A paper describes a structure:
Transcription of eukaryotic protein encoding genes is initiated by the recruitment of general transcription factors together with RNA polymerase II to gene promoters to form the transcription preinitiation complex (PIC).
To further stabilize [name] and reach higher resolution, the complex was incubated with TFIIA and the 105 bp TATA-box containing [name] glyceraldehyde-3-phosphate dehydrogenase promoter (pGAP). An atomic model of [name] residues 36 to 1194, including the 4-subdomain arrangement of the aminopeptidase domain (D1-D4) could be fitted into the cryo-EM map. The linker between the [name] lobe and the Twin lobe is built from two copies of Taf6 HEAT repeats (residues 213–486), thus confirming that Taf6 is present twice in holo-[name]. The WD40 domain forms the core of the Twin lobe and coordinates the arrangement of the three HF domain heterodimers. The cryo-EM structure of yeast [name] rules out the possibility that Taf4, Taf6, Taf9 and Taf12 form a histone octamer-like arrangement but revealed instead a hexameric arrangement. A continuous thread of density suitable to accommodate a double stranded DNA molecule is located between the [name]- and the Twin lobes only in the promoter-bound complex.
Residue numbers in the entry:
A (entry chain A): 36 to 93, 162 to 273, 331 to 381, 395 to 597, 605 to 666, 686 to 736, 785 to 898, 930 to 999, ...
B (entry chain D): 218 to 258, 260 to 305, 307 to 436, 449 to 485
The structure:
């Protein structure tokens, strides 16, 4: 129920030793020889009541309360109560044996945390870290995971909720022991678990703010100390993040329920970034932990990251479910809150279009995945599950469930359901119980939609029937759906195409259009799959069939992830893309028209007009540009009208010019190959003349788009590889890239263009390159440690690019990865090394077999012995799973 | 443009303005030769402003003055079209010819580096004042008035800086040597007598008199001496009774 932790002596020596006075509530639990979670630490006494007794070390197992030397009068007696308190005992509370339940005690024991404790960045201030901050250490220890064992000796389970106090020395404190402040923190009312009990020792500077805002820096587009916190810096970043986080926190707090936190401030620790820690936003105890990205490209990235972090922290810590399989529920609520707040605050690329693009990307990335309801356990699994496909799959299920009927039952059901669990079941929640209550209070069923939706889905055939009834004006029509389809059970121990993943067909909306593409709606029940319906009351094709009845175009929720297929492709795509009062319908019609066939001059003029329309945003303009780029010819190659029109139109800027320059640059310089004079003049003229019409401060978009366009032009147009100065163009591009990189990385300062330029140049070159200077250049740069963002990029690029010979490459890479351990070098070196080796070495069964064969042929040098004998904490778990999967 | 210029200026300041030992001479010579052999005149304004500020707020030791004089001599001797429009020989040559605390406070007696630096400053300032065809060096009246006012006001930088600067500027600019060397009538006795101040530097006074007599001692002088004999009675007998002027001229001409 209570806890008195006393830590100290953590800085300088990078250690943390102190006593621990745990106060049980637990009431029952197990008692006696408790299995306290610990790591590579040093024990320090273990008294209890009177003296001590036997106890095991090691999984810790300290014995307590075993003999009959204690007294049972305290547990057998009872005090007076009021308001029907009861508080009765029984044989467990009394009886006369060990491991009694419903008993109260108070244990104490001193612990010592050395510098060899895995799972906590320790960097004392004494000629061991760096010249910056010499009188201040840095031992930030993660919390979301299993760091409790390495930070102290206690339980690390999730089925036991109990409170604890935070009275450490680094209420209100000041002078206590000379230069020590006894920081007392009650918190004996609300209780938590063991997985969220860390000690992130970071900077003391707290750059918090409030929430009152209206203009300040030309904005925009009962509180708490919001903002962030850095090492005496991050003024502008703390201001912007304080205003945005203040408005979002106020809206979420006023549209959600409650919140027991008052320190809505992040931080910029030096140990960033990390996989499941410094990724976007960390959730600890009224304090955010963000990486060093104050001058990076934000907009939708920083916005979606902050919104998802706030929603996840407000919906992932308020309800404590008994089952850890609530990833779809927490991710769904967080995605809904972040989507509503972002839609009510941000509005430039169309919220509906952004949601549609996210759903399409989630479907494409989930077409070949596994299952949602995985088998639960332990930071790599949490980070992968939280940043995998669950976030993109929870939005579709949440939107489908919330759109299956009325929104009143969903909003009122969730708001009223949250108060029941938040008022009376803090550690008794259940995802199955919540889903059952929601389905029972709002319509029913949902089993086939939840299980079937989380299993798999697909579709690739849609037939339509047309029937004209002139005797009574009955325009019958048919709609049929068909498909042509030919660790989770240890990576699927067997198989199975489905066969029918989508059970119920859900709602079948029939938005039939009248003559000249009108806007008629229809509510088709459908339900059962493979059914029929019935309805009633150069341009030779369009001229002869201008208006006959009703051109019922495609939809309205995509119950079976959905491809369109029906007659009138050109007429339906043109009428739907040129006459439609829905952003989703316009985008779908534009995509279908760009992916199908139509006219040449008409399609180019209509596409240019629609892409240049003021009503269109980044999604419409980018969609039209992508379609015109993929189809810049009815049957030839390039389109002079489309290319000349885009170049002439392209010649505060803002999202229009920023989004048009990137799409036109990465899409313009494609294959080409032939005509090295014109191609080299356009690509070289754009690269050397970049920002030659409106150069200012916004250079990240032009740098990324320019690097991508150059890499795509040199790779696509230089893949084969001089009758047209091909060698001169290649040498000029290589010299220009080398001089630009040496100038931007030598007598300059950057970090948002050097990595993209180096990666784009290396990826564009690759084969037929310099044999061999990659190893000496990367080894010299990494050895010299130039710029914080350069070593990881060079190591990952070299490890992911090499392959031939490989003489001593495994030993050099192993020593470099084992010696360069920190934050971006450790995380980026481990993740980038594993992903680079796997991608470089290698349908699934065939690939795995090939990799195994390659490993067998090159079994020499592994470790395994060494790599595994060195991997600890996160590297021990991740290296254990990955190592076991590679063995 | 704003990035390369700042990078070069800072690289020279950290460099150039820095110091070393084994690579100090090689770095200074390589930098002066490179800046005075390649590159361009884009770094002429920054280098002139930094050199003028450091030379105007420094004046310490003899190493800084020698390095600045060598760099200015190399850049000015191998520069583009910017020195004439910027006009720097007036302030640079004026401060270098008016300096005295650098040597005095930094090796006053036996200021060999001060003498060599004075000769080099007289050569550079002389060439800068002589590189004029129409009006690129109209500082003759200001320099003459400044030297006359300084000599008639006190003994600032006495005695060799003003004589070397004026002698070099007049000799190099004489394209005016007679008017510059004459000026007035009785000037030697009036200058020495007006100054003096119990000059305890016998070797310095004798060296200055001998240097002035040798520098003043020639087509007209050779023709007049060969046709007569330097006018022993006229110069003697006639003229004034300058013991140092007549004795120095006779001893130097004998």
């Amino acid at each position: 129920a209570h806890q008195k932790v006393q830590l100290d002596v953590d800085l300088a020596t990078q250690t943390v030793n102190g006593e621990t006075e745990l106060t049980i509530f637990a009431t029952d639990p197990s008692l006696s020889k408790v299995r306290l979670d610990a790591r590579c630490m040093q024990i320090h006494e273990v008294s209890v009541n009177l003296i001590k007794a036997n106890f095991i070390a090691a999984n810790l197992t300290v014995y307590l309360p075993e003999n009959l030397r204690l007294r049972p009068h305290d547990l057998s007696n009872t005090y007076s109560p009021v308001s029907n308190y009861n508080s009765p005992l029984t044989s467990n509370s009394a009886l006369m044996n060990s491991d009694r339940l419903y008993t109260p005690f108070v244990l104490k024991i001193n612990y010592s945390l050395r510098v060899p404790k895995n799972g906590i960045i320790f960097n004392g201030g004494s000629h061991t870290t760096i010249e910056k901050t010499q009188w201040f250490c840095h031992t930030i220890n993660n919390d979301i995971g299993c760091s409790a064992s390495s930070w102290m000796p206690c339980i690390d389970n999730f089925y036991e909720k109990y409170t604890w106090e935070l009275q450490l020395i680094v209420e209100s404190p000041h002078i206590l022991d000379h230069s020590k402040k006894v920081v007392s923190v009650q918190l004996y009312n609300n209780p938590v678990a063991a997985h969220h009990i860390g000690f992130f020792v970071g900077p003391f500077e707290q750059l918090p703010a409030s929430t009152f805002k209206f203009q300040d820096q030309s904005h925009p587009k009962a509180a708490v100390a919001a903002r962030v916190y850095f090492l005496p810096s991050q003024k502008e970043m703390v201001l912007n993040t304080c205003l945005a986080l203040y408005k979002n926190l106020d809206f979420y707090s006023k549209e959600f329920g409650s919140y027991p936190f008052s320190t809505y401030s992040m931080v910029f620790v030096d140990n960033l970034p990390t996989q499941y820690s410094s990724f976007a936003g960390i959730s600890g105890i009224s304090s955010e932990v963000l990486y060093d990205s104050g001058l990076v490209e934000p907009m939708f990235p920083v916005t979606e990251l902050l919104s998802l972090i706030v929603a996840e922290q407000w919906s992932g810590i308020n309800i404590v479910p008994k089952s850890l399989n609530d990833y779809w529920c927490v991710i769904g609520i967080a995605h809904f809150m972040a989507g509503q707040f972002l839609k009510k605050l941000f509005g430039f690329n169309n919220y509906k279009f952004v949601i549609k693009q996210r759903s399409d990307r989630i479907c494409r990335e989930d077409i070949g995945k596994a299952p949602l309801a995985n088998q639960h356990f332990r930071f790599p699994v949490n980070d992968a599950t939280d940043f995998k496909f669950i976030r993109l799959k929870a939005p579709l299920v949440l939107f489908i469930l919330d759109r299956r009927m009325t929104k009143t039952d969903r909003s009122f059901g969730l708001s009223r359901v949250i108060p029941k669990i938040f008022a009376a079941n803090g550690n008794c929640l259940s995802t199955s119980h919540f889903q059952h209550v929601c389905e029972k209070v709002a319509h029913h069923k949902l089993d086939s939609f939840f299980n079937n939706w989380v299993h798999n889905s697909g579709t690739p055939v849609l037939r339509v029937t047309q029937r004209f009834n002139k005797k009574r004006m009955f325009i019958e029509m048919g709609i049929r759906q068909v498909q042509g389809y030919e660790e989770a059970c240890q990576h699927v121990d067997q198989t199975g195409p489905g066969v029918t993943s989508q059970i119920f067909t859900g709602p079948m909306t029939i938005r039939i259009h009248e003559a000249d593409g009108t806007p008629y709606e229809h509510i088709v029940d459908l339900k059962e799959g493979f059914t029929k319906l019935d309805i009633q009351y150069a341009e030779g094709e369009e001229a002869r069939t201008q208006d006959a009845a009703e051109w019922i175009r495609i939809d309205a929720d995509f119950e079976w992830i959905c491809q369109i297929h029906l007659n009138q492709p050109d007429y339906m795509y043109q009428s739907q893309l040129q006459q439609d009062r829905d952003v989703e319908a316009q985008l779908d019609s534009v995509n279908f028209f760009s992916n199908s066939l139509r006219p040449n001059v008409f399609y180019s003029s209509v596409l240019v007009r629609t892409l240049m329309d003021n009503r269109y945003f980044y999604g419409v303009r980018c969609e039209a540009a992508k379609g015109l780029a993929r189809l810049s010819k009815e049957e030839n190659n390039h389109i002079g009208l489309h290319h000349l029109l885009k170049t002439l139109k392209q010649a505060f800027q803002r999202l229009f010019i920023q989004e048009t320059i990137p799409a036109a640059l990465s899409t313009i310089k494609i294959k080409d190959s032939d005509l090295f004079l014109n191609l080299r003049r356009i690509l070289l003229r754009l690269l050397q003349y970049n920002d030659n019409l409106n150069n200012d401060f916004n250079d990240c978009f032009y740098v990324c788009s320019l690097i991508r366009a150059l890499a795509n032009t040199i790779v696509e147009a230089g893949m084969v590889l001089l009758d047209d100065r091909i060698n001169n163009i290649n040498r000029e591009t290589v010299i220009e890239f080398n001089r630009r990189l040496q100038l931007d990385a030598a007598d300059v300062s950057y970090h948002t263009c050097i990595s993209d330029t180096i990666l784009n140049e290396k990826v564009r070159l690759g084969s037929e390159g310099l044999i061999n200077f990659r190893f000496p250049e990367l080894l010299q740069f990494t050895q010299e440690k130039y710029s914080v963002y350069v070593r990881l990029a060079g190591f990952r690029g070299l490890l992911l690019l090499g392959g031939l010979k490989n003489k001593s490459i495994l030993h050099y890479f192993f020593s470099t990865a084992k010696l360069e351990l920190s934050a971006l070098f450790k995380r980026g070196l481990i993740d980038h090394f594993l992903e680079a080796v796997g991608v470089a070495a290698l349908x699934x069964x065939x690939x795995x077999x090939x990799x195994x064969x390659x490993x067998x042929x090159x079994x020499x040098x592994x470790x395994x012995x060494x790599x595994x004998x060195x991997x600890x904490x996160x590297x021990x778990x991740x290296x254990x799973x990955x190592x076991x999967x590679x063995x | 443009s704003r990035e390369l210029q700042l990078y070069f200026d800072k690289i020279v300041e950290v460099l150039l303005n820095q110091e070393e030992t084994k690579e100090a001479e090689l770095l200074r010579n390589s930098a002066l030769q490179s800046v005075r052999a390649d590159p361009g005149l884009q770094l002429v304004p920054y280098f002139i402003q930094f050199i003028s500020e450091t030379i105007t707020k420094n004046l310490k030791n003899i190493s800084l003055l020698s390095t600045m004089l060598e760099l200015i001599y190399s850049l000015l001797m191998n520069e583009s079209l910017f020195l004439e429009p910027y006009v720097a020989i007036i302030p640079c040559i004026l401060t270098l010819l008016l300096a005295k605390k650098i040597g005095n406070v930094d090796d006053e007696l036996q200021k060999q580096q001060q003498l060599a630096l004075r000769e080099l400053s007289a050569s550079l300032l002389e060439r800068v004042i002589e590189d004029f065809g129409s009006s690129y060096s109209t500082l003759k009246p200001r320099i003459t008035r400044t030297l006359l006012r300084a000599f008639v006001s006190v003994n600032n930088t006495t005695p060799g800086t003003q004589y070397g600067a004026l002698l070099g500027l007049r000799g190099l600019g004489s394209e005016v040597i007679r008017i510059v060397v004459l000026g007035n009538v009785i000037n030697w006795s009036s200058t020495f007598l007006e100054k003096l101040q119990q000059e305890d530097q016998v070797f310095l006074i004798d060296t200055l008199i001998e240097t002035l007599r040798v520098l003043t001692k020639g087509i007209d002088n050779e023709r007049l001496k060969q046709r007569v004999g330097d006018l022993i009675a006229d110069r003697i007998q006639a003229c004034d009774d300058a013991q140092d002027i007549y004795w120095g001229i006779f001893f130097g001409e004998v």
